[PDB]
Symmetry: D2
Subunit: 199 residues, 4 copies
Amino acid sequence: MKHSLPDLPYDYGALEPHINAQIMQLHHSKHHAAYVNNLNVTEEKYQEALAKGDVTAQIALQPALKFNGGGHINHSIFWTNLSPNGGGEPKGELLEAIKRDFGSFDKFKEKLTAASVGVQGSGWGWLGFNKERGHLQIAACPNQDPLQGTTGLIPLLGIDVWEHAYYLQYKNVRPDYLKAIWNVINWENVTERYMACKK
Amino acid sequence: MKHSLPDLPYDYGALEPHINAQIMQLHHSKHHAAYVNNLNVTEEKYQEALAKGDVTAQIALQPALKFNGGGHINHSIFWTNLSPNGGGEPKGELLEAIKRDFGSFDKFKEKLTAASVGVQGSGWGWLGFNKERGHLQIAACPNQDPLQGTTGLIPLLGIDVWEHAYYLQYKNVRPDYLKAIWNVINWENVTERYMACKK
Amino acid sequence: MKHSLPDLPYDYGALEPHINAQIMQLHHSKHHAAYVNNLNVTEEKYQEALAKGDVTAQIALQPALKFNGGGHINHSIFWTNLSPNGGGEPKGELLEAIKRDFGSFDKFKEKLTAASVGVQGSGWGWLGFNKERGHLQIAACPNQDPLQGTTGLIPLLGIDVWEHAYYLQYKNVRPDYLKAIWNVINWENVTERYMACKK
Amino acid sequence: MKHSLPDLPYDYGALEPHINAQIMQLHHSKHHAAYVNNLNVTEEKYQEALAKGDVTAQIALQPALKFNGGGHINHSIFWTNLSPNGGGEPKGELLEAIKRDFGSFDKFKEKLTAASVGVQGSGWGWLGFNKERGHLQIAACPNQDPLQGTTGLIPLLGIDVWEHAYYLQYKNVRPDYLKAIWNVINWENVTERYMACKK
Ligand SMILES: [Mn+3]
Ligand SMILES: [Mn+3]
Ligand SMILES: [Mn+3]
Ligand SMILES: [Mn+3]
């Protein structure tokens, strides 16, 4: 079982004018493609190392596995979090959980925006689900470090704040990108990840 | 004594076609300007905190100080490392030190290139001077973490590999940026930092 | 400011047989004492660096300030968290907050124990208060990194799991130390810190 | 592979009075033993994760693999670095390499001592070999992070400065432990590791 680059559920230009086709094409077809290939390359090296019990080689490979493995996980989620039919507000139990845990939908937007803009360097802003406490929680992750593997939280909604995610369009003004991305959020997908946690 | 944004020693377009004016203008007039202002803001908060002995406030501010303080230091060095009259190879004692410590000028280029391309996320590649051992040394730093404050090495030549340093021109192909930047290296300035370490 | 080593609120042997007098004496009069002395030394150097605008020197000092500064913060709270009159269970609003957020007092005990035993290397287990969410939260911190300065949580109860906190008595068996320490928790102080977080 | 706890090359009390038998026995039969058992447990979980392509699970396991894996690597070298027949100074090519790279044996001793005493929290001091530059190098590592896996340096001589390595005998006075340990260094083994690095 090899990992593969998933096809995008929409055309590269489907999110215009909020995210233009050139960013989407570069972000998906160059960046994500590289993470999955290097993940596959890295897993073969680690697979060899684990069989020989070469702990030094296993440990030397951990950054490459985390970096490329996280990149694959994160972008694969990210594409599903966006939709040309998205935007607006969530409904039903997710909306009620957000009001419950954050006060209002607007306060949640403020807190996730603040977490994303506050990332020093490259990283991600997340809405996550805390299985232990049974409530929603906002977290930020550096580089391509994935949410669940490093915090235990189930990822619901991720915001890529790597400069390659917005720079061609918004240059250094990260707040403009965060403002625009709310217009294409696929709350149906966010809701489906959330409902899968509860039973 | 307040920190200030230094003027560039050349026109925004002086490094064309290797680095185009739009990157230089954005990199200097937006990014660097923000680091120095936030550094000044952060120092006032810390200056208050240190007077009251509020250790919690001092510690809470450390990331902001390191991030914005490093950004100011790094870019201020970076501008001097580039020149429209640069490129080529160094001469004199610096050239001899490089052959001595790295084998050849081309091997040094390979090693600094590899360190820079290998940065996962945002960071810097450096040629530094090890005062303790008295030789040259290559190091990589994450985000805006400055070389001397965190490693003890004296910075000689820095390569900004933040995506805002190349993405508008070279997109995701960081190796193309590293190849081009060798054409505008100010070896005179690199030499002057190096000679200041020796006595 | 010139920080000072606080006097202990009890005799070094007051917690026997749960924590023996030699640990308390070494932990207070040698270990804590060293952090205070080095904190004062570190703060003096930092004040000079800030006056000259030496950003490099400020950044070089951050590990010593956080480590020794945190050590002072952490132990000063820790001593107030213990009492020969301690142990048992809390009452009133703190007990109700624990039931709300953790289910029961026993489950809180199990989770804080797990957080403390799970620390890899040197560090601390904490019960803290999250002002943003208005609930209790368990956290672990590495080395002497202090809870509030690095996480924003208000410390209520801290467990030092540096080996110097137990090794003379409990050797490598950290669970025995954790089981014993519940017997000397000053729940009256934990209650006062919690009430101070509320309006 | 199924890693195993290595037999000690000497009696637990063979290094008295420099390192007492109780530390050696606890350090070998409890501390090292725990790393091996948890390493085998951790490797089994990782093999399953790799088979299912569960990248999240692979990443969640990295801290346990590095910590317990490094603990096995580090202590296995450490035991071979000590000998009742040890102490004194090295001879031959190792002694000459030290003079070349550090000036004198005494200065090497001062610097490795400083590197070991300067570790904040748990960790190790190392003399290592840098294959790239072809010279000796002093490094410190946190917790059980292993030298070669995280830095690329070949370990020659390691100093465990976890408190469990000295506290029963030397209490908080790490310099006394460091001064004493020179008396039991197996320079014959250090020499064999160094020669193995050369062609
Ligand atoms: Mn991305
Ligand atoms: Mn830059
Ligand atoms: Mn302590
Ligand atoms: Mn040990």
